[PDB]
Design a protein around this ligand. Sequence first.
Ligand SMILES: *[C@@H]1O[C@H](CO)[C@@H](O)[C@H](O)[C@H]1NC(C)=O
Ligand SMILES: *[C@@H]1O[C@H](CO)[C@@H](O)[C@H](O)[C@H]1NC(C)=O
Ligand SMILES: *[C@@H]1O[C@H](CO)[C@@H](O)[C@H](O)[C@H]1NC(C)=O
Ligand SMILES: *[C@@H]1O[C@H](CO)[C@@H](O)[C@H](O)[C@H]1NC(C)=O
Length: 262
Amino acid sequence: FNPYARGPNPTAASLEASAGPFTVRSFTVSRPSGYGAGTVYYPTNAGGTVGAIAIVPGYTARQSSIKWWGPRLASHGFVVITIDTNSTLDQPESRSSQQMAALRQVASLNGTSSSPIYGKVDTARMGVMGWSMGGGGSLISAANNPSLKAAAPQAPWHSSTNFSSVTVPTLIFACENDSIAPVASSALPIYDSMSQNAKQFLEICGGSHSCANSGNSNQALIGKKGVAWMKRFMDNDTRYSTFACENPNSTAVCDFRTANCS
Ligand SMILES: *[C@@H]1O[C@H](CO)[C@@H](O)[C@H](O)[C@H]1NC(C)=O
Ligand SMILES: *[C@@H]1O[C@H](CO)[C@@H](O)[C@H](O)[C@H]1NC(C)=O
Ligand SMILES: *[C@@H]1O[C@H](CO)[C@@H](O)[C@H](O)[C@H]1NC(C)=O
Ligand SMILES: *[C@@H]1O[C@H](CO)[C@@H](O)[C@H](O)[C@H]1NC(C)=O
């Protein structure tokens, strides 16, 4: 028996749906501690403590760019914080620090009797996501904090592609037609650098740099993969092993790679 398993046995249809099995509520963080602002999404009815995921936007961008992940993930049994950075022009290292400050504050709110997430969080089970420089920051977070259970950045950018130190299970979303952080010089080299981990590469056909953002036309596939990855690795939930590891057989997938996935 897996003490972290939540929710019904998954299906393709249940993971491609706009909403998971749990009812979601949200709040604005009242006093953001070490980052600009944040929104916490949480399930009201998960039936046990859940892991936490912190999601960071790209350069110039705000929560709106990554907000669709909050309800999508929380509805499957996660506490999700979407942040604004101290500056829209923060670089990846700063974004990583702020992402981890957001996870810290979620852990603090677990212990805060006034918070809607009082006693809802397993602080030992955490995940990192983000777009562009926030995706680079997620990879920095993973490199610096190997106790993180999963990473799933989208269209990442970092001034270095070498993440050979990362031992955290890492899914990279990439966008075929990205001209900001081209796949061939950013996402794919970042993927190829990682030698120690479970990892996956999923490139979306015809995608611009914003192909995994709020308002994308591939929420069925991208949401299925992001939830499956986080369930598999944050919850050690092998019910999700096939959904996490499979080549999905979608018209939307223009490049796929996976390694050390079980
Ligand atoms: C973000 O700003 C807060 C001040 O509100 C500060 O505590 C934190 O250090 C800043 N983080 C970075 C990485 O600059
Ligand atoms: C969060 O608090 C609840 C109860 O108030 C507790 O059961 C749980 O273990 C806490 N999370 C962590 C990681 O300690
Ligand atoms: C990344 O950095 C490590 C540590 O220096 C080095 O051994 C390795 O060759 C580099 N990886 C790539 C893919 O360049
Ligand atoms: C992949 O999906 C298409 C679209 O529905 C389907 O026609 C095809 O038979 C599928 N591939 C496999 C493995 O069956």
